[PDB]
Amino acid sequence: RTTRDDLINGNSASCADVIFIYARGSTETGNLGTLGPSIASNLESAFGKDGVWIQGVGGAYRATLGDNALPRGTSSAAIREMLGLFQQANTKCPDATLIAGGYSQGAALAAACIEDLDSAIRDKIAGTVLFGYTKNLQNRGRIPNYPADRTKVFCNTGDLVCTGSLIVAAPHLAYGPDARGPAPEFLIEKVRAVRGS
Numbered sequence: 068r069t070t071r072d073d074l075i076n077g078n079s080a081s082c083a084d085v086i087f088i089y090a091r092g093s094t095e096t097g098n099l100g101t102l103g104p105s106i107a108s109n110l111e112s113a114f115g116k117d118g119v120w121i122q123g124v125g126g127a128y129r130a131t132l133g134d135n136a137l138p139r140g141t142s143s144a145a146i147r148e149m150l151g152l153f154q155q156a157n158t159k160c161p162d163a164t165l166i167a168g169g170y171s172q173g174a175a176l177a178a179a180c181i182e183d184l185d186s187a188i189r190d191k192i193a194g195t196v197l198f199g200y201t202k203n204l205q206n207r208g209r210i211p212n213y214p215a216d217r218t219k220v221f222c223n224t225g226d227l228v229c230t231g232s233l234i235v236a237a238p239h240l241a242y243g244p245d246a247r248g249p250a251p252e253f254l255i256e257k258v259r260a261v262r263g264s
Contacts, residue, residue, distance in 0.1 A: 069097030098123025
């Protein structure tokens with residue numbers, strides 16, 4: 068439900084084919100928050116429960132609202148936590164296809180982590196979804212060093228964090244429909260594009 072640690076808990080001898088690493092928004096609970104469980108249930112429908120490991124970014128990422136104001140839109144400690152999960156995926160299951168996502172501060176964290184990642188691991192991420200991307204204007208809707216065709220950004224009209232502000236208005240809390248349909252749809256399509264079907 069809101070905490071999933073399938074990568075940390077998973078047996079290396081029986082790796083899933085797909086590993087999804089997700090970072091929640093500010094002040095959200097567990098390590099998946101409000102949007103992560105909806106994406107996870109739809110990925111499990113597509114690949115089966117033993118076919119995909121769902122991993123939230125927990126540990127040092129405390130999703131503190133004030134850290135939205137730091138240079139990269141999150142803390143250095145949270146970026147190091149997400150790097151450690153990508154490194155664990157790459158070591159535990161080197162043949163797995165990776166996919167990623169994040170909401171709000173978690174979207175800035177996913178973009179900062181992927182920008183810093185070694186290309187050999189970064190290039191294994193077949194698709195990334197970002198909701199309420201707080202660095203949308205500043206990065207011109209892109210994740211630095213990562214292809215546009217593997218990126219999908221969901222930024223609502225009137226969600227001020229997509230236009231360079233850090234004000235939280237009602238459209239920022241309206242990504243539920245996207246997390247239920249188009250965001251898992253994009254991730255499944257990008258995994259099948261490289262894995263076949």
